[PDB]
Amino acid sequence: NLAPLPPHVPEHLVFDFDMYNPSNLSAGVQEAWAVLQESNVPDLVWTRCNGGHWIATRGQLIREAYEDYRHFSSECPFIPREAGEAYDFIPTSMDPPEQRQFRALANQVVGMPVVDKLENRIQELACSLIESLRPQGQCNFTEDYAEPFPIRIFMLLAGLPEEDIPHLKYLTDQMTRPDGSMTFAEAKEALYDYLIPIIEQRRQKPGTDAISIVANGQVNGRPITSDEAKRMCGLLLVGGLDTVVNFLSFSMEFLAKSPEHRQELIERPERIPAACEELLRRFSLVADGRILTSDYEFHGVQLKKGDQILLPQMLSGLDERENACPMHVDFSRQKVSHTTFGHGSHLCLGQHLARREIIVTLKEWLTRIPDFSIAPGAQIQHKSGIVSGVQALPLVWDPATTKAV
Ligand code: HEM
Ligand SMILES: CC(C)(C(=O)c1cccnc1)c1cccnc1
């Protein structure tokens, strides 16, 4: 299902990429997207899939478009257009200077000082989850750790019932890796039905949870509205439920396959932080975009006002012009260059939270379960979308090689 090419698009710029179902999926999701950086592919292409849109393929263009909010607006950041259209999260569907005030609040809730406060719980939950898995010699990493770990910390931050996990996660999943079961707007509405009552309750009777702070915050000297709060919280939810969750499984899947990488971390733990950035570069997973606010000529291509452009965060660090041997994991690269957490005004506020969760997991898993591998005859499947994922990650190990702490 290719849409007829608009008049302004030179046929030589066509490259029919399906962000939802790339061709090489079997080879891995990052590998499937990297096809866009092959020699035969222009720097800026048009795809007729998902209704027709541009895709910038190089770290340089992505960062440029990201910096340029005058031309490239966050107003309609999702493809297909109907999704970008229905998209109304804050601060994400706003451009500076408006974005700034909401960002400042969102920072209050997820920023550094919060992580610093949550640290012991993060470490507590990791250790507990791992210890519980250890003696089994086998899990479903995706369902066994990658989901509970980051989710439960979020649920704690947000003050929401663990019981709501399944329902929330389903809906979150519909936004980033649509099934066909529901449209973005339906998914969005349903999360909204969830939130409303909660916000109301927390405007009346404030807690110390993230939702309470958001619901009662100040923006531009006045009180946030209910609708604004509902709209920030919607973003926070997706961030908590759908980001770190997917990242951990790619990393884990790599670790399962590379004994030498595991060992390196065990003997030279001072390398963990460096390793985490490298894994963030290699297993980068997000791809959203922007809308053209006007006609504009960008690197010699004419973009028409209203044109959508996918600026895959994923691709910057995979770009050879940016990283030598991009597909190779090397914990000792002189310069790890990525835009995994975005670029420009929308740089991810939850990055601090995500790094703390990644580092704790590596340190804590390796400690207890130094030696593991993918289950025999398990075929690992990746999934593409706004946020890519791993479908299931069967791991096996000998309990006898584990260490209890
Ligand atoms: C692997 C982990 C994550 C990755 C790769 C990631 C990636 C991103 C990206 C690329 C953006 C910018 C989107 C744009 O420019 O349209 C973003 C924004 C944002 N992320 Fe993260 N995210 C992650 C985890 C988190 C977590 C755990 C939270 C907190 C619950 C969070 C909260 C935010 C917020 C609030 C924004 C909006 C900032 C603004 O619009 O000013 N993210 N994230
Ligand atoms: C692409 C993006 C920004 C994403 O991956 C994300 C979501 C919340 C926090 N951090 C990143 C996203 C995903 C789903 C809904 N809105 C935004």
Curated annotation (Swiss-Prot):
Name of a matching Pfam family: p450
EC number: 1.14.15.1
Top-level division of the source organism's lineage: Bacteria
Protein's cellular compartments: Cytoplasm
GO molecular function annotation: camphor 5-monooxygenase activity; heme binding; iron ion binding
Catalyzed chemical reaction(s): 2 reduced [2Fe-2S]-[putidaredoxin] + (1R,4R)-camphor + O2 + 2 H(+) = (1R,4R,5R)-5-hydroxycamphor + 2 oxidized [2Fe-2S]-[putidaredoxin] + H2O
Entry cofactors: heme
CDD domains according to UniProt: P450cam-like
Keywords tagged on the record: Cytoplasm, Heme, Iron, Metal-binding, Monooxygenase, Oxidoreductase
Binding site for heme: C348
Task of the protein: Involved in a camphor oxidation system.
Protein name, per record: Camphor 5-monooxygenase
Gene: camC
